Short mmCIF file of N, CA and C and ligand atoms in Angstrom, two decimals:
data_model
loop_
_atom_site.label_atom_id
_atom_site.label_comp_id
_atom_site.label_asym_id
_atom_site.label_seq_id
_atom_site.Cartn_x
_atom_site.Cartn_y
_atom_site.Cartn_z
N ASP A 3 -11.83 1.56 -21.00
CA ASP A 3 -11.06 0.96 -20.55
C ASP A 3 -9.76 1.70 -20.17
N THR A 4 -9.85 2.88 -19.86
CA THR A 4 -8.33 3.36 -19.48
C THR A 4 -9.04 3.79 -17.48
N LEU A 5 -7.46 4.29 -17.30
CA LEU A 5 -8.16 4.73 -15.84
C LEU A 5 -9.04 5.80 -15.76
N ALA A 6 -8.91 6.70 -16.48
CA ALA A 6 -10.33 7.68 -16.59
C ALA A 6 -11.42 7.24 -16.57
N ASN A 7 -12.09 6.12 -16.88
CA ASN A 7 -13.65 5.60 -16.57
C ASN A 7 -13.21 4.06 -16.21
N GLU A 8 -12.02 3.99 -15.15
CA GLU A 8 -12.19 2.59 -14.47
C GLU A 8 -13.62 2.22 -13.28
N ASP A 9 -13.93 1.20 -13.44
CA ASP A 9 -15.50 1.12 -12.63
C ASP A 9 -15.18 0.44 -11.37
N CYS A 10 -14.25 0.16 -11.30
CA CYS A 10 -14.22 -0.81 -10.09
C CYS A 10 -13.89 -0.19 -8.70
N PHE A 11 -13.49 0.94 -8.87
CA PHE A 11 -13.31 1.79 -7.56
C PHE A 11 -14.62 1.94 -6.84
N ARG A 12 -14.74 1.86 -5.66
CA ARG A 12 -15.95 2.02 -4.88
C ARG A 12 -16.24 3.43 -4.26
N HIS A 13 -14.91 4.25 -4.08
CA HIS A 13 -15.01 5.75 -3.29
C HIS A 13 -14.21 6.47 -3.68
N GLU A 14 -14.51 7.92 -3.24
CA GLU A 14 -14.05 9.32 -4.02
C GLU A 14 -12.71 9.82 -2.92
N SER A 15 -11.99 9.34 -3.91
CA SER A 15 -10.71 10.06 -3.10
C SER A 15 -10.49 11.60 -2.49
N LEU A 16 -9.68 11.31 -1.25
CA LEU A 16 -9.39 12.70 -0.63
C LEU A 16 -8.24 13.48 -1.30
N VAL A 17 -7.61 12.76 -2.27
CA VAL A 17 -6.50 13.11 -2.71
C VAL A 17 -6.44 13.10 -4.77
N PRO A 18 -7.29 13.92 -4.95
CA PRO A 18 -7.45 13.51 -6.46
C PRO A 18 -6.16 14.30 -7.32
N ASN A 19 -5.42 15.22 -6.90
CA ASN A 19 -4.51 15.51 -7.48
C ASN A 19 -3.32 15.40 -6.61
N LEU A 20 -3.07 14.27 -6.16
CA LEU A 20 -2.09 13.17 -5.80
C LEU A 20 -0.41 14.00 -6.56
N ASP A 21 0.12 14.16 -5.74
CA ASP A 21 1.47 14.19 -5.91
C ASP A 21 2.06 13.16 -6.03
N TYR A 22 2.19 12.82 -7.35
CA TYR A 22 3.32 11.28 -7.26
C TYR A 22 4.59 11.52 -7.28
N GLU A 23 5.28 12.53 -7.05
CA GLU A 23 6.88 12.59 -6.75
C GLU A 23 6.70 12.55 -5.05
N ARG A 24 5.69 13.15 -4.70
CA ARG A 24 5.86 12.96 -3.05
C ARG A 24 5.44 11.70 -2.67
N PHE A 25 4.47 11.01 -3.37
CA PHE A 25 3.88 9.76 -2.99
C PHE A 25 5.03 8.84 -3.08
N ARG A 26 6.18 8.70 -4.07
CA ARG A 26 7.16 7.77 -4.25
C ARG A 26 8.01 7.31 -3.21
N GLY A 27 8.51 6.24 -2.75
CA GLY A 27 9.13 5.83 -2.26
C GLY A 27 8.54 4.74 -1.96
N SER A 28 9.31 3.47 -0.61
CA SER A 28 8.97 2.95 -0.06
C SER A 28 8.11 2.95 1.11
N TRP A 29 6.82 1.74 1.00
CA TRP A 29 5.46 1.42 1.69
C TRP A 29 5.55 0.13 2.21
N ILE A 30 4.98 -0.16 3.29
CA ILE A 30 4.89 -1.59 4.17
C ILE A 30 3.27 -1.45 4.30
N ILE A 31 2.83 -2.46 3.51
CA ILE A 31 1.05 -2.61 3.76
C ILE A 31 0.84 -3.24 5.07
N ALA A 32 0.21 -2.44 6.07
CA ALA A 32 0.13 -3.18 7.23
C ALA A 32 -1.23 -3.77 7.66
N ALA A 33 -2.66 -3.60 6.92
CA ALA A 33 -3.69 -4.42 7.08
C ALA A 33 -4.47 -3.82 6.07
N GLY A 34 -5.57 -4.64 5.80
CA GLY A 34 -6.27 -4.42 4.65
C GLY A 34 -7.88 -5.30 4.88
N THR A 35 -8.75 -4.96 3.78
CA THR A 35 -9.60 -5.67 3.89
C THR A 35 -9.93 -7.32 3.32
N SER A 36 -9.07 -7.95 2.58
CA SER A 36 -9.03 -8.75 2.18
C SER A 36 -8.32 -10.22 2.83
N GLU A 37 -9.33 -10.99 2.93
CA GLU A 37 -8.67 -12.28 3.47
C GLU A 37 -7.49 -13.17 2.97
N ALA A 38 -7.66 -12.52 1.08
CA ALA A 38 -6.81 -13.75 0.69
C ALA A 38 -5.32 -12.93 0.60
N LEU A 39 -5.04 -11.73 0.56
CA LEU A 39 -3.86 -10.90 0.95
C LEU A 39 -3.49 -11.40 1.61
N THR A 40 -3.95 -11.96 3.05
CA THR A 40 -3.22 -11.82 4.35
C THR A 40 -2.10 -13.19 4.24
N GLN A 41 -2.16 -13.99 3.01
CA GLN A 41 -1.23 -14.94 2.73
C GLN A 41 0.25 -13.89 2.33
N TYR A 42 0.18 -12.84 2.19
CA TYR A 42 1.61 -12.21 1.56
C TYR A 42 1.96 -11.51 2.69
N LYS A 43 2.88 -11.71 3.75
CA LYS A 43 3.06 -11.04 4.71
C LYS A 43 4.37 -10.12 4.45
N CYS A 44 4.01 -8.62 5.12
CA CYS A 44 4.82 -7.53 5.45
C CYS A 44 5.30 -6.98 4.27
N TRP A 45 4.17 -6.82 3.00
CA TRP A 45 4.79 -6.75 1.71
C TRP A 45 5.04 -5.33 1.39
N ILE A 46 6.42 -4.73 0.91
CA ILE A 46 6.78 -3.76 0.79
C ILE A 46 6.42 -3.46 -0.41
N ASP A 47 6.17 -2.45 -0.86
CA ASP A 47 6.06 -1.43 -2.70
C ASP A 47 6.87 -0.14 -2.38
N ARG A 48 7.96 -0.02 -3.29
CA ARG A 48 9.10 0.56 -3.77
C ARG A 48 8.78 1.33 -5.34
N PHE A 49 7.78 2.59 -5.40
CA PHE A 49 7.60 3.34 -6.25
C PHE A 49 8.80 3.91 -6.19
N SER A 50 9.53 4.08 -7.58
CA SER A 50 10.75 4.52 -8.00
C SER A 50 10.50 5.63 -9.27
N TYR A 51 11.51 6.60 -9.64
CA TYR A 51 11.70 7.38 -10.79
C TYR A 51 10.36 7.65 -11.31
N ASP A 52 10.05 7.49 -12.67
CA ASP A 52 8.79 7.89 -13.60
C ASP A 52 7.89 6.76 -13.36
N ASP A 53 8.14 5.56 -13.37
CA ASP A 53 7.16 4.84 -13.45
C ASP A 53 7.85 3.13 -13.04
N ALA A 54 8.76 3.07 -12.02
CA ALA A 54 9.14 1.80 -11.47
C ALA A 54 8.38 1.61 -10.41
N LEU A 55 8.31 0.07 -10.17
CA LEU A 55 7.67 -0.47 -8.53
C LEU A 55 8.34 -1.99 -8.65
N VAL A 56 8.71 -1.93 -7.62
CA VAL A 56 9.45 -3.36 -7.15
C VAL A 56 8.70 -3.76 -5.57
N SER A 57 7.93 -4.97 -5.61
CA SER A 57 7.05 -5.42 -4.39
C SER A 57 7.97 -6.58 -4.20
N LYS A 58 8.00 -6.81 -2.57
CA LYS A 58 8.64 -7.85 -1.74
C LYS A 58 7.66 -8.02 -0.67
N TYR A 59 7.86 -9.42 -0.88
CA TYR A 59 7.02 -10.04 0.44
C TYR A 59 7.53 -11.28 0.82
N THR A 60 6.80 -12.03 1.93
CA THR A 60 7.15 -13.34 2.66
C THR A 60 6.13 -14.16 2.43
N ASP A 61 6.24 -15.35 3.01
CA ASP A 61 4.97 -16.08 3.59
C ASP A 61 4.87 -16.08 4.82
N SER A 62 4.10 -16.39 5.98
CA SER A 62 3.87 -16.12 7.26
C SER A 62 4.97 -16.50 8.22
N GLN A 63 5.70 -17.48 7.58
CA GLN A 63 6.88 -17.92 8.57
C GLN A 63 7.94 -16.92 8.27
N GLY A 64 7.99 -16.32 7.51
CA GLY A 64 9.28 -15.65 6.80
C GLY A 64 10.03 -15.90 5.79
N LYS A 65 9.31 -17.22 5.29
CA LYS A 65 9.97 -18.27 4.27
C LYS A 65 9.80 -17.28 2.69
N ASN A 66 10.18 -18.25 1.74
CA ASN A 66 9.83 -17.89 0.38
C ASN A 66 9.62 -16.47 0.30
N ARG A 67 10.69 -15.51 0.12
CA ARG A 67 10.70 -13.97 0.29
C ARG A 67 10.41 -13.67 -1.41
N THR A 68 9.57 -13.20 -1.92
CA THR A 68 9.26 -13.00 -3.41
C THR A 68 9.43 -11.65 -3.81
N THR A 69 10.04 -11.29 -4.88
CA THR A 69 10.19 -10.00 -5.49
C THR A 69 9.25 -10.15 -7.00
N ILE A 70 8.44 -8.70 -6.90
CA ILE A 70 7.59 -8.82 -8.34
C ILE A 70 8.03 -7.10 -8.75
N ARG A 71 8.22 -6.99 -9.95
CA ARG A 71 8.18 -5.94 -10.11
C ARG A 71 7.38 -5.30 -11.61
N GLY A 72 7.49 -4.55 -11.52
CA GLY A 72 6.37 -3.57 -12.64
C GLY A 72 6.44 -2.40 -13.26
N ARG A 73 5.46 -1.51 -13.88
CA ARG A 73 5.34 -0.45 -14.42
C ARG A 73 4.16 0.34 -14.12
N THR A 74 4.42 1.55 -13.36
CA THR A 74 3.25 2.39 -13.08
C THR A 74 3.01 3.50 -13.83
N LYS A 75 1.35 3.88 -13.69
CA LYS A 75 0.97 4.78 -14.41
C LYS A 75 -0.26 5.80 -13.79
N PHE A 76 0.49 6.60 -13.41
CA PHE A 76 -0.40 7.70 -12.72
C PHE A 76 -1.38 8.76 -12.94
N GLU A 77 -3.07 8.62 -13.10
CA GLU A 77 -3.51 10.19 -12.99
C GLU A 77 -4.23 10.31 -11.98
N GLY A 78 -3.72 11.73 -11.28
CA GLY A 78 -3.99 12.14 -9.76
C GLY A 78 -3.58 10.78 -9.37
N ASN A 79 -4.73 10.64 -8.35
CA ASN A 79 -4.88 9.57 -7.55
C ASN A 79 -4.92 8.16 -7.95
N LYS A 80 -5.37 8.08 -9.49
CA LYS A 80 -5.18 6.94 -9.77
C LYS A 80 -4.26 5.94 -10.39
N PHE A 81 -3.57 4.86 -10.32
CA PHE A 81 -2.65 4.75 -10.84
C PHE A 81 -2.88 3.11 -11.07
N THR A 82 -2.39 2.65 -12.34
CA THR A 82 -2.53 1.21 -12.56
C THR A 82 -0.72 0.17 -12.38
N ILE A 83 -0.91 -0.73 -11.86
CA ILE A 83 0.08 -1.16 -12.00
C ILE A 83 0.25 -2.28 -13.18
N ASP A 84 1.49 -2.81 -13.83
CA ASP A 84 1.18 -3.45 -14.80
C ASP A 84 2.55 -4.40 -14.47
N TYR A 85 2.32 -6.03 -13.49
CA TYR A 85 3.42 -6.65 -13.37
C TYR A 85 3.97 -7.69 -14.18
N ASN A 86 5.02 -7.84 -14.26
CA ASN A 86 5.88 -8.65 -15.15
C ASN A 86 4.94 -10.07 -15.11
N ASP A 87 4.77 -10.97 -16.08
CA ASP A 87 4.16 -12.11 -15.99
C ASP A 87 3.71 -12.88 -14.99
N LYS A 88 5.03 -12.81 -13.82
CA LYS A 88 5.07 -13.17 -12.36
C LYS A 88 4.16 -12.83 -11.38
N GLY A 89 3.71 -11.56 -11.17
CA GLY A 89 2.90 -11.44 -10.46
C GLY A 89 1.40 -10.54 -10.88
N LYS A 90 1.15 -11.29 -11.97
CA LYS A 90 -0.33 -10.78 -12.92
C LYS A 90 -1.24 -10.68 -12.13
N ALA A 91 -1.29 -11.47 -11.10
CA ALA A 91 -2.62 -11.59 -10.21
C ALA A 91 -2.67 -10.44 -9.58
N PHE A 92 -1.61 -9.40 -9.23
CA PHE A 92 -1.52 -8.40 -8.25
C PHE A 92 -2.09 -7.20 -9.85
N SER A 93 -1.51 -7.22 -10.84
CA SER A 93 -1.69 -5.86 -11.87
C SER A 93 -3.25 -5.72 -11.67
N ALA A 94 -3.40 -4.47 -11.77
CA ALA A 94 -5.09 -3.82 -11.59
C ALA A 94 -5.07 -2.14 -11.41
N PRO A 95 -6.06 -1.76 -11.47
CA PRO A 95 -6.26 -0.53 -10.99
C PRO A 95 -6.11 -0.31 -9.82
N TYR A 96 -5.36 0.47 -9.19
CA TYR A 96 -5.85 1.20 -7.96
C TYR A 96 -5.83 2.43 -8.19
N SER A 97 -6.42 3.42 -6.48
CA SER A 97 -6.35 4.29 -6.23
C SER A 97 -6.46 5.06 -5.01
N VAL A 98 -5.31 5.90 -5.04
CA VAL A 98 -4.83 6.35 -3.31
C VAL A 98 -5.90 7.24 -2.89
N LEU A 99 -6.68 7.02 -1.76
CA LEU A 99 -8.03 7.52 -1.31
C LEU A 99 -7.51 8.63 -0.26
N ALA A 100 -6.77 8.28 0.52
CA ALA A 100 -6.16 9.24 1.41
C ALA A 100 -4.51 9.41 1.45
N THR A 101 -3.84 10.47 1.77
CA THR A 101 -2.55 9.98 2.57
C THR A 101 -1.88 11.84 2.88
N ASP A 102 -0.89 11.23 3.61
CA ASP A 102 0.10 12.51 4.25
C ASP A 102 1.21 12.62 3.53
N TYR A 103 1.58 11.84 2.81
CA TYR A 103 2.95 11.76 1.93
C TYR A 103 3.72 11.43 2.95
N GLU A 104 3.87 11.61 3.83
CA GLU A 104 5.36 11.72 4.65
C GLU A 104 5.14 10.45 5.42
N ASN A 105 3.98 9.80 5.91
CA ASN A 105 3.38 9.00 7.11
C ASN A 105 2.71 7.34 6.13
N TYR A 106 1.27 7.99 5.83
CA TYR A 106 0.97 6.78 5.58
C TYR A 106 -0.16 7.29 4.22
N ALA A 107 -0.71 6.18 3.73
CA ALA A 107 -1.83 6.26 2.91
C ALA A 107 -2.76 5.06 2.74
N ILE A 108 -3.86 5.15 2.36
CA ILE A 108 -5.18 4.21 2.31
C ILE A 108 -5.54 4.12 1.01
N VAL A 109 -5.39 3.10 0.21
CA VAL A 109 -5.39 2.51 -1.23
C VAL A 109 -6.78 1.50 -1.38
N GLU A 110 -7.32 1.73 -2.41
CA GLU A 110 -8.26 0.90 -2.97
C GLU A 110 -7.69 0.29 -4.61
N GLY A 111 -7.84 -0.92 -4.32
CA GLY A 111 -7.75 -1.28 -6.01
C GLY A 111 -8.27 -2.79 -5.96
N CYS A 112 -8.13 -3.23 -7.19
CA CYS A 112 -9.19 -4.63 -7.80
C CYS A 112 -8.42 -5.42 -8.33
N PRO A 113 -6.82 -6.15 -7.87
CA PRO A 113 -6.49 -7.13 -7.99
C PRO A 113 -7.26 -8.86 -7.93
N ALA A 114 -7.28 -9.66 -8.72
CA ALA A 114 -7.80 -10.74 -8.78
C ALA A 114 -7.33 -11.34 -7.46
N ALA A 115 -5.72 -11.44 -7.25
CA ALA A 115 -5.57 -11.81 -5.95
C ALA A 115 -6.22 -11.21 -4.57
N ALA A 116 -6.89 -9.93 -4.69
CA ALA A 116 -7.61 -10.19 -3.27
C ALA A 116 -9.12 -10.15 -3.55
N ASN A 117 -9.53 -11.23 -4.55
CA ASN A 117 -10.95 -11.30 -4.84
C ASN A 117 -11.60 -10.29 -5.70
N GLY A 118 -10.70 -9.61 -6.45
CA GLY A 118 -11.19 -8.18 -7.27
C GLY A 118 -11.31 -6.89 -6.28
N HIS A 119 -11.07 -7.04 -4.80
CA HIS A 119 -11.40 -5.56 -4.23
C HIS A 119 -10.71 -5.34 -2.89
N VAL A 120 -10.08 -4.56 -2.75
CA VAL A 120 -9.29 -4.20 -1.52
C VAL A 120 -9.02 -2.90 -0.82
N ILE A 121 -9.33 -2.65 0.16
CA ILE A 121 -9.09 -1.55 0.85
C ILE A 121 -7.67 -1.62 1.49
N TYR A 122 -6.39 -0.83 1.88
CA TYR A 122 -5.36 -1.38 2.53
C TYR A 122 -4.60 -0.10 2.95
N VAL A 123 -4.31 0.08 4.21
CA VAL A 123 -3.76 1.15 4.96
C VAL A 123 -1.61 0.81 4.73
N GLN A 124 -1.04 1.63 4.07
CA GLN A 124 0.49 1.11 4.23
C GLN A 124 1.22 2.74 4.97
N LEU A 125 2.40 2.17 5.42
CA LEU A 125 2.98 3.39 6.21
C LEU A 125 4.11 3.32 5.39
N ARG A 126 4.75 4.68 5.46
CA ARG A 126 6.22 4.59 4.55
C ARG A 126 7.32 3.93 5.35
N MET A 127 8.25 3.24 4.61
CA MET A 127 9.10 2.63 4.98
C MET A 127 10.35 3.61 4.70
N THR A 128 11.18 3.99 5.88
CA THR A 128 12.29 4.35 5.74
C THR A 128 13.55 4.46 6.70
N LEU A 129 14.68 4.03 6.05
CA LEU A 129 15.52 4.12 6.92
C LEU A 129 16.34 4.95 8.15
N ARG A 130 15.25 6.14 7.45
CA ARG A 130 15.07 7.21 8.78
C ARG A 130 14.26 7.06 9.89
N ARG A 131 13.59 6.09 9.72
CA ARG A 131 12.84 5.70 10.85
C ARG A 131 13.08 3.85 11.67
N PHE A 132 13.50 3.31 10.39
CA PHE A 132 13.64 2.03 10.50
C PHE A 132 15.32 1.69 10.76
N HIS A 133 15.43 1.16 12.36
CA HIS A 133 16.76 1.22 12.64
C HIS A 133 17.11 -0.56 12.69
N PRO A 134 16.90 -1.30 11.99
CA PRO A 134 17.31 -3.15 12.32
C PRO A 134 18.08 -2.68 13.65
N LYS A 135 17.29 -3.39 14.93
CA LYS A 135 17.86 -3.70 15.86
C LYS A 135 18.38 -5.18 16.21
N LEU A 136 19.43 -5.54 15.15
CA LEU A 136 20.13 -6.24 15.16
C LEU A 136 20.27 -7.57 16.42
N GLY A 137 19.37 -8.19 16.02
CA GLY A 137 18.89 -9.40 17.21
C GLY A 137 17.37 -9.53 17.16
N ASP A 138 16.74 -8.69 16.37
CA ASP A 138 15.09 -8.75 16.28
C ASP A 138 14.82 -9.88 15.08
N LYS A 139 13.82 -11.04 15.83
CA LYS A 139 13.31 -12.15 14.77
C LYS A 139 12.18 -11.06 13.78
N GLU A 140 11.34 -10.43 14.45
CA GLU A 140 10.49 -9.37 14.23
C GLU A 140 10.84 -8.13 13.52
N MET A 141 11.47 -7.55 12.57
CA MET A 141 12.13 -6.50 12.37
C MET A 141 10.83 -5.47 11.88
N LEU A 142 10.29 -6.22 10.85
CA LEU A 142 9.31 -5.38 9.80
C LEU A 142 8.05 -5.23 11.04
N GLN A 143 7.60 -6.02 11.65
CA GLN A 143 6.59 -6.31 12.79
C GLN A 143 6.41 -5.48 13.55
N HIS A 144 7.68 -5.10 13.92
CA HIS A 144 7.94 -4.02 15.00
C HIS A 144 7.61 -2.73 14.50
N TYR A 145 8.40 -2.60 13.35
CA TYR A 145 8.57 -1.21 12.77
C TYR A 145 6.97 -1.08 12.46
N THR A 146 6.21 -1.89 12.04
CA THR A 146 4.84 -1.54 11.23
C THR A 146 3.72 -0.93 12.29
N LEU A 147 3.83 -1.76 13.47
CA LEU A 147 2.93 -1.72 14.69
C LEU A 147 2.91 -0.15 15.22
N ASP A 148 4.41 0.39 15.55
CA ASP A 148 4.86 1.78 16.29
C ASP A 148 4.34 2.52 15.25
N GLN A 149 4.70 2.48 13.61
CA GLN A 149 4.61 3.73 12.99
C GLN A 149 2.45 3.54 12.63
N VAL A 150 2.41 2.82 12.64
CA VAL A 150 0.71 2.83 12.84
C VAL A 150 0.24 3.59 14.09
N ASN A 151 0.72 2.90 15.00
CA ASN A 151 0.58 3.52 16.59
C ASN A 151 0.32 5.04 16.40
N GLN A 152 1.73 5.27 15.76
CA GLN A 152 2.22 6.72 15.78
C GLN A 152 1.46 7.79 15.06
N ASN A 153 0.56 7.17 13.90
CA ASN A 153 0.03 8.07 13.16
C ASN A 153 -1.65 7.64 13.09
N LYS A 154 -1.83 6.84 14.32
CA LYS A 154 -3.27 6.10 14.42
C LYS A 154 -4.36 6.74 14.11
N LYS A 155 -4.26 8.34 15.05
CA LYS A 155 -5.42 9.03 14.73
C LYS A 155 -6.00 9.53 13.61
N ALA A 156 -4.79 9.57 12.26
CA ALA A 156 -4.94 10.26 11.20
C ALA A 156 -5.58 9.33 10.61
N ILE A 157 -5.16 8.07 10.76
CA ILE A 157 -5.11 6.86 9.59
C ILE A 157 -7.11 6.65 10.05
N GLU A 158 -7.40 6.70 11.73
CA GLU A 158 -8.49 6.28 11.72
C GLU A 158 -9.71 7.17 11.24
N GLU A 159 -9.20 8.60 11.26
CA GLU A 159 -9.67 9.59 10.70
C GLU A 159 -10.68 9.74 9.57
N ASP A 160 -9.35 9.08 8.32
CA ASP A 160 -9.38 9.06 7.16
C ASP A 160 -10.56 7.50 6.92
N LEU A 161 -10.23 6.44 7.75
CA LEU A 161 -10.88 5.43 7.30
C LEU A 161 -12.26 5.35 7.87
N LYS A 162 -12.63 6.58 8.49
CA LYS A 162 -13.75 6.80 9.19
C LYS A 162 -14.72 7.26 7.96
N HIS A 163 -13.87 7.97 7.08
CA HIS A 163 -14.47 8.88 6.23
C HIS A 163 -14.96 7.66 4.68
N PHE A 164 -14.37 6.62 5.32
CA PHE A 164 -14.99 5.63 4.00
C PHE A 164 -15.05 4.17 4.61
N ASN A 165 -16.24 4.56 5.96
CA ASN A 165 -17.09 3.62 6.61
C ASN A 165 -16.06 2.25 6.91
N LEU A 166 -14.94 2.64 7.05
CA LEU A 166 -13.83 1.52 7.90
C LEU A 166 -13.43 1.79 9.06
N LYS A 167 -12.95 1.00 10.16
CA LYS A 167 -12.18 1.28 11.39
C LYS A 167 -10.63 0.36 11.19
N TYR A 168 -9.78 0.87 11.85
CA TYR A 168 -8.71 0.06 11.63
C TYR A 168 -8.91 -1.20 11.91
N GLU A 169 -9.58 -1.38 13.34
CA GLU A 169 -9.98 -2.97 13.91
C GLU A 169 -10.24 -3.95 13.51
N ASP A 170 -11.52 -3.41 11.84
CA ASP A 170 -12.16 -4.01 11.21
C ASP A 170 -10.88 -4.84 10.13
N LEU A 171 -10.19 -4.30 9.92
CA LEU A 171 -9.24 -4.70 8.89
C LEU A 171 -8.23 -5.96 9.07
N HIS A 172 -7.89 -6.80 8.44
CA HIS A 172 -6.97 -7.92 8.78
C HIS A 172 -5.90 -7.66 8.70
N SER A 173 -4.80 -7.53 9.25
CA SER A 173 -3.59 -7.23 9.73
C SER A 173 -2.86 -8.13 8.75
N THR A 174 -1.61 -7.61 8.15
CA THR A 174 -1.57 -8.37 6.63
C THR A 174 0.40 -8.42 7.57
N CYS A 175 1.07 -7.53 8.47
CA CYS A 175 2.07 -7.63 8.90
C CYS A 175 2.32 -8.21 10.44
N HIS A 176 2.26 -9.42 11.03
CA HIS A 176 2.24 -9.72 12.13
C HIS A 176 1.01 -8.73 12.74
N1 AEF B 201 0.78 -3.21 -4.91
C1 AEF B 201 0.74 -3.64 -3.64
C2 AEF B 201 -0.57 -4.93 -4.01
C3 AEF B 201 -1.35 -5.49 -2.93
C4 AEF B 201 -2.01 -4.77 -2.46
C5 AEF B 201 -2.23 -5.29 -0.80
C6 AEF B 201 -1.34 -6.27 -0.34
O1 AEF B 201 -2.11 -6.43 1.06
C7 AEF B 201 -0.80 -6.71 -0.97
C8 AEF B 201 -0.70 -6.14 -2.54
#
């Protein structure tokens, strides 16, 4: 019942010795294989310090901004998130399947909110690349698409490895 013998993962990671300190920071979830997760728009995960997680998302009109907080535990590529009672539908085991640390990562996991399985693509969110161009209604959405496009070859190559294509994912940030 630990991460060591978690059975819901379907794929072998390309990053079994994931460097958690390098993985840490803010990530925006661009797309994934779960229809249910399309209801949580422009989700940003913020992994910080030893084991902290702050997750923030909206509905599809950008209304009802929601924040859930939790604790993580990493063993190589595997990680659990235990959310505060609030986001318990998202508490699950997860696995980083691929990342270049600096730009993108592809993650699998088994939350109830995803009908027990999802693979998703996330791009790094940093003020070094994100200049809220004051006047933009679609701040997040434009950032995400540009970051996707900029890293598209690498993302597509890794997805191919897990028998997926970007175009087959549901977009989860416009
Ligand atoms: N810690 C992220 C949990 C999650 C994964 C994928 C997604 O589209 C929304 C939430």
